Amino acid sequence: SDEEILEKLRSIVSVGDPKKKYTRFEKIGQGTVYTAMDVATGQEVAIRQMNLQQQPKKELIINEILVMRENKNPNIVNYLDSYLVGDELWVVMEYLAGGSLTDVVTETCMDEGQIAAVCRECLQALEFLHSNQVIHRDIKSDNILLGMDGSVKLTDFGFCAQITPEQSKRSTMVGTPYWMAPEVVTRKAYGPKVDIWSLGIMAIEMIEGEPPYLNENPLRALYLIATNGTPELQNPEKLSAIFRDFLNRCLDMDVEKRGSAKELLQHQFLKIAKPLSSLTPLIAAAKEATKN
């Protein structure tokens, strides 16, 4: 029900109008996203404003807020608050000034130490979510946001699933095709390891600048993923043996043998990680390249 949805949102949100608690609104996207500043803390924030009249699948937005509220983590972009003014919903997130992993991988060339650090941080978020019975289901570089200091944080819980021991598998196809695990199309029961596959595809992005089959229609990419299995690198000989092992564990066609997040946090590839601050020059370079 539309009313019932508004009543649920009313119960979730803080009271009143947010124009009090925040200032300095600059639009950066179009629902409509702004940067702004918390007048109290000084913190810079990203605010999404949605007219619920024009929002097709509002149960997903409720789910998104409740999951974010109850699953805070250092490696997840912090959800700060929400407000409802009539039909206008505001969601307030922390702002990370370093853009996204997509900016970095398209504008710069990461080394294996930098790649290992990013993969580690992402696996920390995945282990936490998976241990909490949450599957992200749309892992990709666009949903990895970066601080100027090299912080790595996962975002966008618009597609996530909550599972249980009695229903530990999902079948809805919600993910972005190029990052989607083959079992999502070949079977109708996937689990948390679809996020592990996606992380494997993000590692390919960090190496080559794009996921496999980017140049293909998404419909065709998905047929190719399902039929070709574990994707092939352009120049595997340029990678370390330990990085190739790590990729193999993320991109195993056999779901049982594919790594869990818990298992992959132990992988020796992660032990070559550089300090996260090693990313700062790449982040600065990508930000300058993408500013227009």
Side-chain angles (χ1 to χ4, degrees), residues 115-241:
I115 299 174
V118 170
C119 287
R120 183 192 67 216
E121 296 299 297
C122 295
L123 283 169
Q124 288 166 186
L126 291 184
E127 190 279 327
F128 172 75
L129 286 172
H130 291 172
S131 77
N132 279 347
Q133 296 193 95
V134 178
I135 316 174
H136 182 289
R137 297 206 296 189
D138 201 22
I139 295 298
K140 54 186 185 176
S141 61
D142 280 346
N143 291 337
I144 304 306
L145 304 190
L146 306 171
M148 290 297 331
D149 66 350
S151 299
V152 172
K153 298 186 189 201
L154 178 55
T155 202
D156 198 346
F157 286 85
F159 308 76
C160 72
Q162 299 178 80
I163 64 176
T164 68
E166 331 79 57
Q167 297 100 4
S168 60
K169 298 296 170 55
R170 303 302 288 250
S171 63
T172 315
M173 304 177 52
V174 296
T176 310
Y178 302 111
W179 292 258
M180 169 177 291
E183 61 272 13
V184 175
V185 73
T186 74
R187 297 196 302 259
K188 275 178 198 164
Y190 66 77
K193 285 187 188 167
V194 303
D195 286 337
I196 300 299
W197 179 283
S198 305
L199 169 65
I201 305 301
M202 287 199 317
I204 299 177
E205 299 183 71
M206 292 189 260
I207 300 158
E208 298 180 344
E210 305 167 358
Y213 313 125
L214 185 61
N215 35 312
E216 304 294 322
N217 196 291
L219 271 44
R220 190 188 306 264
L222 196 64
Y223 163 78
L224 289 175
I225 292 164
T227 62
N228 285 341
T230 306
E232 201 183 318
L233 284 184
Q234 201 63 3
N235 288 89
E237 332 79 20
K238 258 67 175 152
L239 299 193
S240 68

Side-chain angles (χ1 to χ4, degrees), residues 4 16 27 113 150 265 289:
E4 194 176 345
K27 198 210 78 172
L265 285 166

Side-chain angles (χ1 to χ4, degrees), residues 93-105:
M93 308 290 302
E94 84 183 304
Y95 173 68
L96 288 194
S100 76
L101 188 56
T102 304
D103 299 334
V104 162
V105 306

Side-chain angles (χ1 to χ4, degrees), residues 2 6 13 23 66 98 126 129 178 199 214 241 256 260 289:
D2 273 16
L6 294 165
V13 299
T23 173
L66 292 178
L126 291 184
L129 286 172
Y178 302 111
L199 169 65
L214 185 61
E256 299 301 292
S260 69

Side-chain angles (χ1 to χ4, degrees), residues 13-49:
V13 299
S14 298
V15 304
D17 195 289
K19 266 290 190 296
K20 292 192 179 54
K21 194 186 171 193
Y22 311 93
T23 173
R24 292 204 205 187
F25 287 70
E26 298 176 349
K27 198 210 78 172
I28 70 169
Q30 189 160 6
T32 305
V33 179
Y34 305 68
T35 59
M37 181 183 77
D38 183 313
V39 299
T41 63
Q43 183 170 14
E44 204 172 352
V45 298
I47 303 179
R48 172 165 36 126
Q49 305 188 143

